[PDB]
Write an enzyme that holds these catalytic residues in place. Structure first.
Site, PDB file in Angstrom:
ATOM      1  N   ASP A 148      -0.557   4.285  -4.034  1.00  0.00           N
ATOM      2  CA  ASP A 148       0.286   3.927  -5.174  1.00  0.00           C
ATOM      3  C   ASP A 148      -0.331   2.884  -6.119  1.00  0.00           C
ATOM      4  OD1 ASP A 148       2.465   4.137  -6.840  1.00  0.00           O
ATOM      5  OD2 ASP A 148       3.821   2.969  -5.569  1.00  0.00           O
ATOM      6  N   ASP A 166       0.838  -7.008  -2.975  1.00  0.00           N
ATOM      7  CA  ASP A 166       1.348  -6.718  -1.645  1.00  0.00           C
ATOM      8  C   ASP A 166       2.594  -5.829  -1.712  1.00  0.00           C
ATOM      9  OD1 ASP A 166       2.366  -9.216  -2.831  1.00  0.00           O
ATOM     10  OD2 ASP A 166       3.592  -9.430  -1.020  1.00  0.00           O
TER      11      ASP A 166
END
Length: 299
Positions: A148, A166
């Site tokens: 992604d 993150d």
């Protein structure tokens, strides 16, 4: 498979060493915060940090898969990847202390530049490109694909450095960046490679592909890719060999880089280390000191 449990190791931080300063916006598992945490950086007194939490209404299971995700990062130690500083498994809520990135996600930061002052210089872009390619090259080296990669999942540090963001931080406002391909699961079709779209596979190669759509974002100040085309029209276009158009005033070099990232055959696209190589003479000297690229580890 692995069990749904969390064994506290040396990442566990005493809750009493943490303070919440304010909210930053709801996240995947719950409200994320900004604050301070003692004993997180070596030889350092206090540290400004991001604190991801898990709703009270969450299942022990979701709560378990929260610490598991954070633990994957227990292994990473790269300057261009938002770092995990600690974990708070004991008690409620369950926390995850991260490196704070005062300037948020790259997509927001970029769009905020749209509104004397001139747009980002090639030198600054190459910087972001190289810095992002560095994190991905590090992760891929550790046998990790992103699945992604996009501007929305990149963070801008206080001093403007870009790091691989993150988990569980994508802003809820970019919800549109996803689509239920074939009425099934939510996928970021506008950043996906032709082969990932058609075969459902994600490899180091599909990351370079996404990287290219991100280089595009940097240059178009974060324009939705395939703006005219709808989600369903994108799947045909890309799978059939359609590329994105060279954005206006986009330096030759960057689109040149993009073009290679989008080789239809995945093995023909450059890997992350090679991308850095073709742009290392443009990177700032400090990169030589903090990058994984020049780091020992690169073998």
């Amino acid at each position: 498979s692995a069990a749904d449990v969390y064994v506290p190791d040396e990442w566990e931080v005493a809750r009493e060493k943490i303070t919440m300063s304010r909210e930053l916006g709801q996240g995947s598992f719950g409200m994320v915060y900004e604050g301070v945490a003692k004993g997180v950086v070596k030889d350092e007194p206090e540290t400004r940090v991001a604190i991801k939490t898990v709703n009270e209404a969450a299942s022990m299971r979701e709560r378990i898969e929260f610490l598991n995700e954070a633990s994957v990062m227990k292994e990473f130690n790269c300057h261009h990847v938002v770092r995990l500083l600690g974990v708070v498994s004991q008690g409620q809520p369950t926390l995850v202390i991260m490196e704070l990135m005062t300037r948020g996600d790259l997509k927001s930061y970029l769009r905020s530049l749209r509104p004397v002052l001139a747009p980002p210089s090639l030198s600054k872009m190459i910087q972001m490109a190289g810095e992002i390619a560095d994190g991905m090259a590090y992760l891929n080296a550790n046998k990790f694909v992103h699945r992604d990669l996009a501007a929305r999942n990149c963070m801008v540090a206080e001093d403007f450095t870009v790091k691989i963001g993150d988990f569980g931080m994508t802003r809820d406002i970019y919800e549109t960046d996803y689509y239920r391909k074939g009425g099934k699961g939510l996928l970021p079709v506008r950043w996906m490679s032709p082969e990932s779209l058609k075969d459902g596979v994600f490899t180091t190669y599909s990351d370079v592909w996404s990287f290219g759509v991100v280089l595009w974002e940097i240059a178009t100040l974060a324009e939705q890719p395939y703006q005219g085309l709808s989600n369903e029209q994108v799947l045909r276009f890309v799978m059939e060999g359609g590329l994105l158009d060279k954005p206006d005033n986009c330096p030759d070099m960057l689109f040149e880089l993009m073009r290679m990232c989008w080789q239809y055959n995945p093995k023909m696209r450059p890997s992350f280390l090679e991308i850095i190589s073709s742009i290392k003479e443009e990177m700032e000297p400090g990169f030589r000191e903090v990058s994984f690229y020049y780091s020992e580890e690169n073998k």
